[PDB]
Specification:
Layout (H helix, E strand, L loop, with lengths): L2 H18 L4 H6 L7 H9 L2 H24 L2 H4 L3 H19 L4 E2 L4 E4 L2 E3 L10 H15 L5 H12 L10 H21 L14 H6 L1
Antiparallel strand pairs: 1-2, 2-3
Helix pairs in contact: 1-4, 1-8, 1-9, 4-6, 6-8, 8-9
The structure holds the ligand CC(=O)N1CCN(C(=O)N2CC[C@](c3ccc(C(OCc4c(F)cccc4C#N)(C(F)(F)F)C(F)(F)F)cc3)(S(=O)(=O)c3ccc(F)cc3)C2)CC1.
Length: 213
């Protein structure tokens, strides 16, 4: 890939992300000061685990629709066979949503944007998944403490999705060429913005895979 083709791949991935980012960053950042009161937190804690599961599963389904649209707008992804497109989305959609979450996470007070306001992990107590919730918050904190930008989320999530190691891929080598190109685009963008120093602080390769499995 040429240095011009890579700059075009960066722009192409960031364009797809911009069209499918679901929530405006500026609205998430403005709402940081709008925090749930103790009464509102208690209201969530009193809900049944079934009600919390219905709300969260609904928000998760909606977030996954935007990730599918992000994938459909990557010309590289659309050149893959139907089997591989399904395999990559089924294995990676949830991991992409997990990376996207860091933009809605406030590392100053350990809160996340949820249904209109920011709240801590105790908001999700009725689910009875405190170890899972803790892990999600820790993963978000590790990216949020790096001030992970919109273009870094765009390039990183494209890499999360285009993974040649996913079981069931019919054209592994085609996926790998697209993955290698996306890694070059990611590193190139980090150099132009003097952000290469985040590479050594980024979560290890399969941390998302183990968290989501
Ligand atoms: C584009 C953007 O700016 N976004 C920020 C706002 N959005 C967002 O945070 N989410 C969309 C749906 C949000 C969501 C929904 C459900 C889940 C749950 O775990 C899914 C899961 C596993 F089952 C296993 C391993 C990892 C994960 C993950 N991720 C599920 F079981 F209910 F499905 C849960 F157990 F954690 F609840 C996880 C996040 S959410 O806002 O409701 C929310 C819920 C919990 C939480 F700790 C934080 C938030 C995650 C959407 C993305």
């Amino acid at each position: 890939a040429s240095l011009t083709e890579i700059e075009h791949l960066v722009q192409s991935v960031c364009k797809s992300y911009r069209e499918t980012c679901q929530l405006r960053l500026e609205d998430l950042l403005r709402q940081r000061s709008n925090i749930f009161s103790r009464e509102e937190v208690t209201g969530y804690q009193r809900k049944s685990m079934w009600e919390m599961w219905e709300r969260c599963a609904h928000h998760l389904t909606e977030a996954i629709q935007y990730v599918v649209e992000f994938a459909k707008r990557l010309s590289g992804f659309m050149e893959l066979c139907q089997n591989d497109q399904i395999v990559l989305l089924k294995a990676g959609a949830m991991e992409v949503v997990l990376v996207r979450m860091c933009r809605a996470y406030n590392a100053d007070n350990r809160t996340v944007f949820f249904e209109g306001k920011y709240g801590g992990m105790e908001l999700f107590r009725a689910l009875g998944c405190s170890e899972l919730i803790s892990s999600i918050f820790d993963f978000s904190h590790s990216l949020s403490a790096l001030h992970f930008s919109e273009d870094e989320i765009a390039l990183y999530t494209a890499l999360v999705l285009i993974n040649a190691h996913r079981p069931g891929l019919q054209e592994k080598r085609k996926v790998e060429q697209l993955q290698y190109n996306l890694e070059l685009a990611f590193h190139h963008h980090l150099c132009k913005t003097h952000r290469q120093s985040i590479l050594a602080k980024l979560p290890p390769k399969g941390k998302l895979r183990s968290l989501c499995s």
